[PDB]
């Protein structure tokens, strides 16, 4: 069920052994020695990766290395669709702005931090959650010259359990991380967006990097003189495969969970956050898809923006499915009723008062939060011309020296970014008319961004006329209209420009609401510190995990499918047969790499096929994962690598609030399929020879 | 492969059926000289199957089989189709006009008799051996003069089987007083509506209840208040034992058509002409229609039925093409015919090879015409509503060119215009369908082969399909009400003769009939060659492990209650539950609304003896029986011959099964008799129906 601190491995090891863990506790995590933990990295700030050779080879997801593959892709060498295989170390490609982070040491500093916080005075100081304050405390504990005396090392303190527990991490950061290997996009992103959040899955979602360092294996920025890192620990690769019910475990960096939501917060998340996102994105996506299906040129222009909107749309459909069908609200009521009853028995009313502060804060902000999500989904991300240019002060002064031309030239640049290759004013007008029609139905006049009152006042409720007028009269309405402005620019034109006044007033309302709502965060944070303290004192720090906060966690469970619905079973394992049956040459998302087809047709699976002679692609597990777990190593009972986490099924997204044992799975690319693609598709034998592959 | 067997073939099959789990004795299932379970099976209303389930003539069939009857008794006041219908007394059971139920009283092999008669050959290429007229003449001859009057309610029919190598005479007993007794609400009877058609898993309670009435003697009689329920020879016992994975199941009913003896060439033709054209042309039409329906709620209401009617055979063609591509249908027919050619050479009889060569050469020869025929039928005849706009008759053109016969000919033409341009017709939607269909049609059909009027697109309108179509509606008498009324006020023959919509409809129907007439001569040589082909197959492999094509005659099929894997890592089980109904519930989608009395039953777990051992409420199951169109309403029997369900659908993955049974994909979709009884009991509250049935533990 949980995402456990490395500190909590002692407490869980017995349970883990019962479930079939075979390795010694300290080979998995040793607080004062080298352990398997030392082979796990935070990859590029948002993913997990793992070291898989004694020359610093790193596996992570294809979607995690996507930006680095694309940044090295040209018309000449298109690595994004052809894939990339460095045939010698010297051909591995440097990456600007990349990091991998090792967790060198972890320390409980809870008492240290609570001692320091007693120098407060102000009882509702938010210093106990402030990264600046906790960094001051980290530096004090580490030393004034720590990073100078310990090259490559830094320290960080983070709050857990709502501020009831503090850990200090000693981190080692490398920034010379080179692209070694990537499958073609047809494999790395086979389902593309259609199979996002979907099990069964057939995606070979991996890419390969290498950590470089100085002659001593100490971090250094890119240099021709850097050499592969010789790490203290790397994963062995298993070719023994998985069977239904096999023990599996993951280490990685889950981003965020909401395991201590009150019932009132579940209702809020459903009825404001989720319902508004779902309603507004469905309107936006409906207009966009009509327009994409009618015009192939609009399809090419709007396809990335359509997919970008669909991704969190799907997550929200999945979350609301959990709220409706798995009793998330009811289970949090039960949790808080049980605490309140226990606090009544003990004669301590602070737990009931804490739950009541949370309910009262949620109820008080309901209207503001609804108006925020309506403007953010409806307009800020719903309407492209919400993000049209707004003149700075350094521009309006300059228009009224003769650096008039500098101001125009800056605004021109911003206009061209807004009205770029992928912008259609006609599509944006149709989307705007549909989104504004919904917004104006849901937000009363007295709550409208100032400019949107003109719909009632000037335009007699005609949303189409209001939108038509914004584009007819705006200097950003068309290239011709801007060039007329740029020739005879006056500050009076800009100050009265309908698109500028639109963009200004919707962004004013958005910030006004943001600023009104941020105060309501703190009483909930403070009440949560007391709430979670009560939950742990009542039920113990043993069957209820601290919310994810982008720190190293382990999770364990089994290779197991699930039943999505009556009379339907999804198994634990997909095969290359599943790729071939999805092949559709005319649908760019489901194209199959010819070498991979050939490999399938000729059953050229070598040592990577299963018992049956069938070629595995992916499996799913009852491990507890969330965003941040993307490139996480999946381990054997023996701690050998059996795959790479890359997704989770939509039925499981509500698992950030309440783990769903019968529906929530981690979606994992089989390491056997990873090696097959390297070997038979990449022809990159040196990478196989460099890894340690166990019979 | 796994078959639709003649009742005659039960003898030679019984042993295999027994080792598959059949317990009941052979002559309790079918006895040619006595009462058997065969006597409880009816052809329901010409197309469906039903079964007698009481000694007071109660009949079960599907909801979709009893739909029109349920609807014809529905008003705003008592909407039976929405709320269901539960006659609390026999007297309250509603008569239906134009209904029948046909019992198969006797079946007889008359092969020798028909072959003896056929020898009075003039022409050796005579198609009389398949002519229903000629076989009716041979049946009347054999049955006797005035058999009609000498045995009221009885009738005789001879049918050809195995391409004219086997003939059966059927004695049929027909009842026409068949009363509506019971129906679930539409929300149960067609729960998935069209979304779940051809879909497993399936959660539809597809049943309705009738009663056969007769005279005092239990002889057939038209409706009269004097008629009394039929006391039948035989009815089904109902089982509450239920089903488990791998249980024996069998079906009897009236499968309509199969093509089990297609050559490889005929499979290629079916795929590349019939199915690819229907798929391509209906995808164009459905695409335009859906965009118009989604943009305008009024068009949605107007075009919903037309959209749905287009989709049914669309989905079938997609399933059928999937089987051809993925299940080796073409390769298996090629192997079957290569087998017979090999055996033929060793017998020193080349006529088998000559017969397959005749079919291949005929299929090859007619390819171009048949492509043109499907293109115009799918593209225009079916594709474009204004293809079926009024055409003035010979006698209406004639009558318009000195009397008050003029106001007669104009009123005939107004009724046909009003029928075409009815409350569901949008000229604007039709113009957009027509532009897309004609563009595809004109791409595929060269100028030389176009209906004469479609030549104007090139010659008059410089290739502008939109202009051509705009012009038809602008200037045509039937382009709008105003334009017709203007014509009706001052009608000329010369107006109609040059009307562009008339010339279009006329022109496309001319070409449709020309292609049909050119294609007909190719049927006969394939039919005679098929007589020889199937003759050879029977002689080579025996009348044992290859069944005759369906031909709407009574057949039995057996297999097991078993799910299947549609694709990698996906398994569908053998049994759906009421839980699956609740999972699909969607109050804002008329297809997936859940009856409140049924939701309460689920919530209270009020299932009585109808729930399975685990206390789950079963809804539907699926079996490896071999069914097709015509098997709707068919009784599904236990190993002991007790009713365990009603067949009601088949999964899309199994539609290629009309050419080649597909053991790992093809399933009969069956409503669980336990769910039928639950719905009668706890939704209809119609206890008298339960007491009238014979229910075994
Ligand atoms: Cl290291
Ligand atoms: Cl011969
Ligand atoms: Cl099969």
From Swiss-Prot, chain A:
Record site: Is essential for the Asp/Glu P1 specificity of DPP11: 648
Outcome of mutating residue 648 to A: Loss of catalytic activity
Effect of loss of the gene: Cell growth is retarded. Complete loss of hydrolysis for ac-DNLD- and LE-MCA. The efficiency of peptide utilization of proteinaceous nutrients is reduced in mutant cells.
Disulfide bonds: 47-64
Molecular-function annotations in GO: dipeptidyl-peptidase activity; peptide binding; serine-type aminopeptidase activity
Record keywords: Aminopeptidase, Disulfide bond, Hydrolase, Protease, Serine protease, Signal
Any Gene Ontology CC annotation: cell surface
Activity versus pH, per record: Optimum pH is 7.0.
Record text on activity regulation: Enzyme activity is completely blocked by diisopropyl-fluorophosphates, moderately by phenylmethylsulfonyl fluoride (PMSF) and 4-(2-methyl)benzenesulfonyl fluoride, and slightly by pepstatin in vitro.
E.C. numbers: 3.4.14.-
UniProt effect for mutating residue 648 to S: The Asp/Glu preference is inverted, i.e., peptidase activity toward Leu-Asp-MCA nearly disappears, whereas that to Leu-Glu-MCA partially remains
Effect of residue 630 to A: Loss of catalytic activity
GO process annotations (BP): developmental cell growth; peptide catabolic process; proteolysis
Effect in UniProt of substituting residue 648 to G: Drastically decreased but still significant activities against Asp/Glu substrates, as well as detectable activity against substrates harboring hydrophobic residues at the P1 position
Classification via Pfam families: Peptidase_S46 (PF10459)
InterPro entries (UniProt xref): Pep_S46, Peptidase_S1_PA, Peptidase_S1_PA_chymotrypsin
Active-site feature positions: 63, 205, 630
Location within or outside the cell: Cell surface
Domain of life: Bacteria
Function: Catalyzes the removal of dipeptides from the N-terminus of oligopeptides. Shows a strict specificity for acidic residues (Asp or Glu) in the P1 position, and has a hydrophobic residue preference at the P2 position. Preferentially cleaves the synthetic substrate Leu-Asp-methylcoumaryl-7-amide (Leu-Asp-MCA) as compared to Leu-Glu-MCA. Is involved in amino acid metabolism and bacterial growth of asaccharolytic P.gingivalis, that utilizes amino acids from extracellular proteinaceous nutrients as energy and carbon sources.
Family: Belongs to the peptidase S46 family.
Quaternary state and interactors: Homodimer.
PANTHER family: PERIPLASMIC PEPTIDASE SUBFAMILY S1B (PTHR38469:SF1)
UniProt protein name: Asp/Glu-specific dipeptidyl-peptidase
Name of the gene encoding the protein in the UniProt record: dpp11
From Swiss-Prot, chain B:
UniProt keyword annotations, A-Z: Aminopeptidase, Disulfide bond, Hydrolase, Protease, Serine protease, Signal
Name under which the protein is recorded: Asp/Glu-specific dipeptidyl-peptidase
GO terms, biological process: developmental cell growth; peptide catabolic process; proteolysis
Protein role: Catalyzes the removal of dipeptides from the N-terminus of oligopeptides. Shows a strict specificity for acidic residues (Asp or Glu) in the P1 position, and has a hydrophobic residue preference at the P2 position. Preferentially cleaves the synthetic substrate Leu-Asp-methylcoumaryl-7-amide (Leu-Asp-MCA) as compared to Leu-Glu-MCA. Is involved in amino acid metabolism and bacterial growth of asaccharolytic P.gingivalis, that utilizes amino acids from extracellular proteinaceous nutrients as energy and carbon sources.
Effect recorded for residue 316 to A/N: Significant increase (or preservation) of the catalytic activity
Disruption phenotype: Cell growth is retarded. Complete loss of hydrolysis for ac-DNLD- and LE-MCA. The efficiency of peptide utilization of proteinaceous nutrients is reduced in mutant cells.
Site residues, Is essential for the Asp/Glu P1 specificity of DPP11: 650
Intracellular or extracellular location(s): Cell surface
Bridged cysteine pairs (disulfide): 48-65
InterPro entries from the UniProt entry: Pep_S46, Peptidase_S1_PA, Peptidase_S1_PA_chymotrypsin
Catalytic machinery residues: 64, 206, 632
Record family assignment: Belongs to the peptidase S46 family.
Record text on activity regulation: Enzyme activity is completely blocked by diisopropyl-fluorophosphates, moderately by phenylmethylsulfonyl fluoride (PMSF) and 4-(2-methyl)benzenesulfonyl fluoride, and slightly by pepstatin in vitro.
Assembly mode: Homodimer.
Gene3D superfamilies assigned: Trypsin-like serine proteases
Summary of pH dependence: Optimum pH is 7.0.
GO molecular function: dipeptidyl-peptidase activity; peptide binding; serine-type aminopeptidase activity
EC number annotated for this UniProt entry: 3.4.14.-
Assigned GO CC terms: cell surface
């Amino acid at each position: 069920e949980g995402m456990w601190l490395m500190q909590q491995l002692g407490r869980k090891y017995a349970q883990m052994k019962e479930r079939g863990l075979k390795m010694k506790e300290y080979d998995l995590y040793n607080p004062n020695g080298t352990s398997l933990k030392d082979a796990v990295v935070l990859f590029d700030g948002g993913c997990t990766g793992e070291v898989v050779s004694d020359r610093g080879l790193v596996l992570t997801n294809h979607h995690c290395g996507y930006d680095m593959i694309q940044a090295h892709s040209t018309l000449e060498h298109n690595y994004l669709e052809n894939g990339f295989w460095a045939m010698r170390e010297a051909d591995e490609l440097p990456n600007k702005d990349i990091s991998v982070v090792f967790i060198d040491k972890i320390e409980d500093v809870t008492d240290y931090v609570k001692k320091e916080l007693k120098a407060i005075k102000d009882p509702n100081s938010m210093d106990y959650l402030s990264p600046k304050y906790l960094q001051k405390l980290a530096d004090k504990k580490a030393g004034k010259n720590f990073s100078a005396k310990n090259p490559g090392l830094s320290v960080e303190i983070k709050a857990f359990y709502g501020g009831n527990l503090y850990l200090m991490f000693t981190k080692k950061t490398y920034t010379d991380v080179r692209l070694v290997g990537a499958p073609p996009s047809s494999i790395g992103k086979f389902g593309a967006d259609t199979d996002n959040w979907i099990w069964p899955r057939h995606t070979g979602d991996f890419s390969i990097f290498r950590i470089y360092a100085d002659k001593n294996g100490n971090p250094a920025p890119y240099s021709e003189d850097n050499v592969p890192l010789k790490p203290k620990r790397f994963f062995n690769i298993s070719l023994g495969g998985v069977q239904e019910n096999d023990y599996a475990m993951i280490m990685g960096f889950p981003g965020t969970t909401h395991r201590y939501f009150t019932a009132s917060e579940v209702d809020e998340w459903k009825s404001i956050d989720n319902d508004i996102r779902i309603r507004m994105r469905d309107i936006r996506q409906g207009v966009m898809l009509r327009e994409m299906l009618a015009d192939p040129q609009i399809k090419i222009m709007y396809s990335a923006k359509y997919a970008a909107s669909q991704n969190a749309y799907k997550r929200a459909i999945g979350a609301n499915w959990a709220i409706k069908t798995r009793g998330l609200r009811q289970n949090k009521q039960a949790m808080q009723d049980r605490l309140i009853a226990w606090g009544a028995k003990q004669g301590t009313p602070r737990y009931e008062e804490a739950v009541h502060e949370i309910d009262a804060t949620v109820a008080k902000r309901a209207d503001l939060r609804r108006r925020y999500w309506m403007i953010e989904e409806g307009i800020i991300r719903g309407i492209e011309f919400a993000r049209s240019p707004i003149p700075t002060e350094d521009e309006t002064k300059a228009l009224q020296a003769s650096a008039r031309k500098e101001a125009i030239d800056k605004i021109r640049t911003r206009y061209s970014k807004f009205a770029n290759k992928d912008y259609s004013a006609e599509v944006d007008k149709k989307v705007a008319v549909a989104m504004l029609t919904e917004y104006l139905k849901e937000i009363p006049y007295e709550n409208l961004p100032l400019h949107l009152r003109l719909v009632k006042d000037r335009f007699a409720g005609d949303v189409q006329a209001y939108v038509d007028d914004i584009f007819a009269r705006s200097v950003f309405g068309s290239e011709a209209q801007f060039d007329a402005f740029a020739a005879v620019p006056s500050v009076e034109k800009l100050a009265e420009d309908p698109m500028v006044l639109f963009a200004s007033s919707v962004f004013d309302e958005y910030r006004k609401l943001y600023n009104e709502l941020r105060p309501y965060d703190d009483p909930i944070l403070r009440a949560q510190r007391t709430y979670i303290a009560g939950l742990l004192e009542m039920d113990g720090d043993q069957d209820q995990f601290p919310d994810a906060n982008l720190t190293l966690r382990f999770t364990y469970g089994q290779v197991k499918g699930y039943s999505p619905r009556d009379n339907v079973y999804y198994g634990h394992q997909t095969t290359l047969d599943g790729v071939m049956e999805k092949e559709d040459p005319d649908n760019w998302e489901f194209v199959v790499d010819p070498k991979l087809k050939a490999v399938y047709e000729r059953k050229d699976f070598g040592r990577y096929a299963d018992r049956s002679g069938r070629m595995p692609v992916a499996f799913c597990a009852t491990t507890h994962t969330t965003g941040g777990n993307s490139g996480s190593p999946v381990m054997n009972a023996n701690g050998e690598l059996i795959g790479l986490n890359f997704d989770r099924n939509w039925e499981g997204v509500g698992g950030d609030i309440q783990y769903l044992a019968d529906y929530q799975r981690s979606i994992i690319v089989d390491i056997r399929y990873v090696l097959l693609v390297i070997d038979k598709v990449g022809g990159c034998q040196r990478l196989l020879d460099e890894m340690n592959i166990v019979p």
